[PDB]
């Protein structure tokens, strides 16, 4: 899997491939790896599909119950709940999650939670098997306070390379835009991104 979240001027954008593999066989070629835990807090799932789904489901439950009592939770609060599950059950979980959310005070924020259960707040995060091939590219090309069109291109070009080199990654490039304006879903097909 190839997943990334990038902070920009107006908020944050989540990007992912659509390929789920068992061995060398593609079980699902149109997977949605970008999942909603709250209205403007989303996550990118990588690793066990059973685990990443089970974790995401519990967090959505916790943040729904949080909202009932204490109103809208921060992106940091969501990442803390993810960390708590991942860290305390590190022996029984294979899950690399990127948490991304839009507050009105804090704007766009990105937290990455690797296998360990550690939390890392970053301007942008890349994860999954495909990520290895685009560390060089992403580091050289990422700038802070990019525009929406710049950030969409940055994610599209990055995941395009990840997909090209990683057998485990492929299909469509899904993206989810988190800004004050609201939530926008974007899709990009092979015929576009392959020939970038």
């Amino acid at each position: 899997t190839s997943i990334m979240a990038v902070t920009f001027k107006d908020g944050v954008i989540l990007g992912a491939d659509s390929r789920t593999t068992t061995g060398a066989y593609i079980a699902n070629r149109v997977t949605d790896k970008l999942t909603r835990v709250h209205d403007k807090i989303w996550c990118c799932r990588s690793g066990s599909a059973a685990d990443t789904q089970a974790i995401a489901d519990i967090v959505q439950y916790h943040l729904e119950l949080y909202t009932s009592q204490y109103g809208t939770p921060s992106t940091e609060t969501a990442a803390s709940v993810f960390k708590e599950l991942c860290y305390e059950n590190k022996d029984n979980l294979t899950a690399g999650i990127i948490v991304a959310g839009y507050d009105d005070k804090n704007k766009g924020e990105v937290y990455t939670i690797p296998l360990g259960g550690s939390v890392h707040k970053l301007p942008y995060a890349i994860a999954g098997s495909g990520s290895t091939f685009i560390y060089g590219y992403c580091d050289k090309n990422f700038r802070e306070n990019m525009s929406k069109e710049e950030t969409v291109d940055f994610i599209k070009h990055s995941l395009s390379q990840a997909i090209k080199w990683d057998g485990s990654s492929g299909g469509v490039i899904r993206m989810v835009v988190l800004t004050a304006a609201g939530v926008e879903r974007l899709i990009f097909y092979p015929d576009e991104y392959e020939q970038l």
């Binding site: 593999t21 066990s48 599909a49």
Partner: peptide, 4 residues
């Protein structure tokens, strides 16, 4: 088993 499925991976991502």
């Amino acid at each position: 088993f499925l991976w991502x």
